[PDB]
Amino acid sequence: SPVMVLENIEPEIVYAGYDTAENLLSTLNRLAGKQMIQVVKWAKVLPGFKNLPLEDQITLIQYSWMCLLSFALSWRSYKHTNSQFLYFAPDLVFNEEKMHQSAMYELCQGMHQISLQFVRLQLTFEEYTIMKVLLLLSTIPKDGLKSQAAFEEMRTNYIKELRKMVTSWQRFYQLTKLLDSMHDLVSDLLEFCFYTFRESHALKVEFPAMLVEIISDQLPKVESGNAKPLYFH
Numbered sequence: 513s514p515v516m517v518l519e520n521i522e523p524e525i526v527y528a529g530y531d532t533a534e535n536l537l538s539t540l541n542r543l544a545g546k547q548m549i550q551v552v553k554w555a556k557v558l559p560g561f562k563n564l565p566l567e568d569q570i571t572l573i574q575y576s577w578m579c580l581l582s583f584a585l586s587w588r589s590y591k592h593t594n595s596q597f598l599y600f601a602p603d604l605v606f607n608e609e610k611m612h613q614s615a616m617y618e619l620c621q622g623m624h625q626i627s628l629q630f631v632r633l634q635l636t637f638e639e640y641t642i643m644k645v646l647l648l649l650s651t652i653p654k655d656g657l658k659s660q661a662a663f664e665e666m667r668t669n670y671i672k673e674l675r676k677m678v679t680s681w682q683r684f685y686q687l688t689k690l691l692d693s694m695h696d697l698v699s700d701l702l703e704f705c706f707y708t709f710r711e712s713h714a715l716k717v718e719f720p721a722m723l724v725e726i727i728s729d730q731l732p733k734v735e736s737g738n739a740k741p742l743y744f745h
């Protein structure tokens with residue numbers, strides 16, 4: 513039973529341990545590193561995904577960590593603030609002022625825009641959950657994965673699970689359209705993230721060992737079009 517397993521393994525609260533732009537960004541990076549810990553424990557108990565060679569699991573996670581965390585940022589903003597603010601952590605909610613101080617003001621707007629989508633679609637917890645798994649399987653290597661045959665079977669099943677959900681019948685295509693749009697939002701998130709990373713030493717913006725670990729060997733798997741985003745439309 514996919515749905516029941518998905519809600520149970522869903523990670524829980526996590527403090528960021530909370531003011532210039534550099535300190536604000538350093539904080540979110542540390543919070544990111546702490547959230548990626550919950551993402552790793554969550555994925556390892558994920559149906560299907562946990563049976564693919566460990567190499568595919570790690571790769572998929574590195575291609576999609578930004579998706580998963582920002583998408584969650586939305587669920588959280590949706591649930592705790594009716595999408596009115598950015599709920600990164602309990603001790604750190606963002607409003608236009610904050611979004612401004614992080615030197616991240618447009619990027620914030622885009623995420624807040626996803627949240628707004630949630631309240632408008634009246635997104636469901638059951639939908640959210642399956643959708644977060646699909647985001648995990650939203651980007652693959654340009655020429656395919658090791659166990660590609662297995663990958664597609666699993667991905668098709670979760671797509672089927674989302675279908676079982678919505679069955680008005682159009683809501684399906686609405687949620688999968690929303691999923692494709694996430695790609696656009698995350699591609700901008702990463703470009704800015706890749707830049708701050710490259711200048712971290714000069715900008716005084718702290719990045720956790722984990723994020724450094726991921727972003728580092730992610731760039732090579734992306735550059736020269738070595739990555740392939742999967743869309744529904």
Ligand SMILES: CC(=O)[C@H]1CC[C@H]2[C@@H]3CCC4=CC(=O)CC[C@]4(C)[C@H]3CC[C@]12C
Pocket residue numbers: 537540541543544547578581582584585599600601616619701704705706708
């Ligand atoms: C400083 C920086 O480049 C920013 C740009 C987009 C930002 C990320 C946006 C998505 C996100 C949501 C969270 O709830 C935790 C922190 C993260 C993972 C953010 C950490 C800081 C990033 C990587």
